[PDB]
Amino acid sequence: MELSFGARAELPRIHPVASKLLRLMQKKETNLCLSADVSLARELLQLADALGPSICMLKTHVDILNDFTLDVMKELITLAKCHEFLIFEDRKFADIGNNVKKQYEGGIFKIASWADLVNAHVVPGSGVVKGLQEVGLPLHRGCLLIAEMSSTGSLATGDYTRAAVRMAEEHSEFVVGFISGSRVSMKPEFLHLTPGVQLEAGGDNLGQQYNSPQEVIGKRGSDIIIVGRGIISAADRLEAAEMYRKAAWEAYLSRLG
Amino acid sequence: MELSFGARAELPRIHPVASKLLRLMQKKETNLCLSADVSLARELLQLADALGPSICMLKTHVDILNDFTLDVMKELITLAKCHEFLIFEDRKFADIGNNVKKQYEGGIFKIASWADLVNAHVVPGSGVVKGLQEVGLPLHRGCLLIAEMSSTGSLATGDYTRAAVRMAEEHSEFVVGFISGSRVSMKPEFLHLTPGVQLEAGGDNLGQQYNSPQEVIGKRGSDIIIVGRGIISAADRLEAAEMYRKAAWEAYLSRLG
Ligand SMILES: O=c1ccn([C@H]2C[C@H](O)[C@@H](COP(=O)(O)O)O2)c(=O)[nH]1
Ligand SMILES: O=c1ccn([C@H]2C[C@H](O)[C@@H](COP(=O)(O)O)O2)c(=O)[nH]1
Ligand code: PRO
Ligand code: PRO
């Protein structure tokens, strides 16, 4: 009884941000999130424009953007609306509730003003979600909980993963899914996004480990692949994005049957 | 065989940042870290100047500082040198190694350029330390690992805490201690800093829980208290800082015997 992305977008308990995302995934035949891990605004915006049609989401990394301004984010929003993708900020919210509330809304980045999605670690307990929600729910935003990590020695396993799933399921008005390596929730309203993805086997020199789109979407049951260096270190980033999109999309279609 | 702060500063395996910190704690009779959770540079700098003599450390929160500039941090460094306290940035590094390396060195904040200490969550595995170390060791910086958290529902317990201690003990060239609620390492070279501290019992509305300086330094064996609202919401923040300093210092002296 596995539903297509387009049918999941209509589920009774679906969050509006998840619904918007699932609808554009189905329309564009993409379940690829670009991890835009670049330090220059011009490169961020040129990638967003050229790859926009091929992606369902762009993961920003504002903490490394040397020439960040709120105007850069305005131009990114224009591209996101034009090409139809969501903006997901990488910042790892992972503090007591009172702190994440202020980190999400304020400072120089004003993340909640432009990010459709943010992610949080569950280690502080559910106050991390409650603090974020106090800013995000009035703004009609969503959050992803980090239930598993792709890196060597990850402690997001076993009971920790189970606690992340429970915290999501109990905060479904704001939490729309997970960063995970696999399907972790049985409820189809939740999105599973998986980083640590490359076409070829391997890793990096600092604990990253890769699995293929076919493995993580097809066998492990995740919904979306998050891809950084597999695309951004390639010469032709458009062609690379298309190879990842086609891989993730076919893997989804084959599992759906 | 519990050693004073001044003797711990001379231990063979002590990290230079820890040694500097332990020496000024002993000299100034303070084991208080101010959590400067304010949004205005003028308030940050006025607190740093007036409370500098009473603290061993100031925990900055640059992600909420509405008028951050690197010049603000230069003026903070002048005060830190004048009054003799370390600068500890609150940012919860909690990503794969390749990402934390860039987050620590770059973007608009350039944290490694001005922060003596940073803290990291251990959930990603030891790549989080290896990535930070690649920037921090050349800069002669130190790191604290979050082994326990003060908030309700914290998952930093049991095997997770044990993994944080092992990761610290195996990366002693860069990791100088812990954010924890108690002594977690038996090795006296490591510093234990404890947030969630107030003179009175209670908590906040978003999962924070408080224990007293006497409990966390005296009974639980921690070295330093981290105090935010107990000081910054008080009318006279200097008097409040002095009450917390005297509480934490006496608790340390009584345990030492
Ligand atoms: O468990 C996690 C959570 C986030 N990520 C983030 C970190 C980076 O920004 C991307 C992965 O980038 P890549 O260049 O594909 O290795 O996703 C991760 O790789 N693993
Ligand atoms: O486990 C932790 C780790 C960091 N903190 C940080 C969060 C805040 O910046 C301070 C606590 O501030 P306070 O106002 O004293 O509740 O320390 C914490 O409270 N608990
Ligand atoms: O056999 C394997 O696991 C890998 C997957 C990507 C290419 N070959
Ligand atoms: O009895 C207690 O635990 C609390 C501690 C702070 C003041 N009274």
Report which of A48, A65, A62 is spatially closest to residue A241, judged by C-alpha positions. Answer: A48
Q: How far apart are CA A53 and CA A25, in angstroms?
A: 11
Helix A127-136 vs helix A97-105: crossing angle, to nearest 10:
30
Chain A nearest CA to B148, separation (Å): 9
Give the number of domains in chain B. 1
A10 and B CB contact within 8 Å: no
Backbone region of residue B197 per phi and psi (left: phi > 0; alpha: psi in -120 to 50; beta: other values): beta
> A38 lies in a domain?
yes
Q: What is the 3-state secondary structure (H, E, C) of chain A?
A: CCCCHHHHCCCCCCCHHHHHHHHHHHHHCCCEEEECCCCCHHHHHHHHHHHHHHCCEEEECHHHCCCCCHHHHHHHHHHHHHHCCEEEEEEEECCCHHHHHHHHHCCCCCHHHHCCEEEEECCCCCHHHHHHHHHHCCCCCEEEEECCCCCCCCCCCCHHHHHHHHHHHCCCCCEEEEECCCCCCCCCCCEEEECCECCCCEECCCCCEEECHHHHHHHCCCCEEEECHHHHCCCCHHHHHHHHHHHHHHHHHHHHC
> A220 lies in a domain?
yes
Q: How far apart are CA A26 and CA B83, in angstroms?
A: 60
Query: Which residue's CA is minimally distant from atom 2 of ligand 4?
Result: B201
How do strand B202-203 and strand A209-210 relate by DSSP bridges?
unpaired
> A257 lies in a domain?
no
Ligand 1 atom nearest to A90, measured from its CA: 9
CATH number of A199's domain: 3.20.20.70
Closest partner residue to A125 (CB to CB) among B62, B126, B155 is: B155
Chain B nearest CA to A156, separation (Å): 6
Residues of chain B with C-beta less than 8 angstroms from the C-beta of A122: 155
Closest partner residue to A149 (CB to CB) among B66, B103, B124 is: B124
Q: Are the CB atoms for A107 and B66 separated by under 8 Å?
A: yes
Phi, psi of A186, deg, nearest 5: -85, -5
Retrieve residue B60's tokens: 């900055």
For chain A, count helices (H), then strands (E): 11, 10
Q: Are the CB atoms for A38 and A44 separated by under 8 Å?
A: yes
- Per the document, the length of chain A is 257
> A125 lies in a domain?
yes
Q: Which of A92, A134, A227 is most worth mutating to test chain B (most B CB atoms within 10 A of its CB)?
A: A92
Retrieve residue A8's tokens: 């999941």
**Ligand number with the minimum distance to the CA of B219:** 4
B10 and A CB contact within 8 Å: no
Cβ within 8 Å of A, B 139-178: 146, 149-156, 160, 163
The alpha carbon of B64 and the centre of ligand 2 are apart by a number of angstroms equal to 14
> A65 lies in a domain?
yes
The alpha carbon of A198 and the centre of ligand 3 are apart by a number of angstroms equal to 9
Cβ within 8 Å of A, B 41-70: 61-66, 68
Q: Are the CB atoms for A119 and A92 separated by under 8 Å?
A: yes
Nearest CA in chain B to A157: B123
Query: Which residue's CA is minimally distant from atom 1 of ligand 4?
Result: B201
Give me the domain span that covers residue B180: 5-256
Q: How far apart are CA B182 and CA A253, in angstroms?
A: 51
Q: How far apart are CA B174 and CA A235, in angstroms?
A: 36
Range list of H helices, B58-146: 70-83, 97-105, 111-114, 127-136
Q: Are the CB atoms for A143 and A126 separated by under 8 Å?
A: no
The alpha carbon of B222 and the centre of ligand 2 are apart by a number of angstroms equal to 15
- Look at A156 and B131 and tell me if their CB atoms are within 8 Å: no
Residues of chain A with C-beta less than 8 angstroms from the C-beta of B60: none
Q: Which of B32, B34, B35, B198 to mutate to test the pocket of ligand 2 (most atoms within 8 A of CB)?
A: B35
Catalytic residue among A28, A59, A95, A101: A95
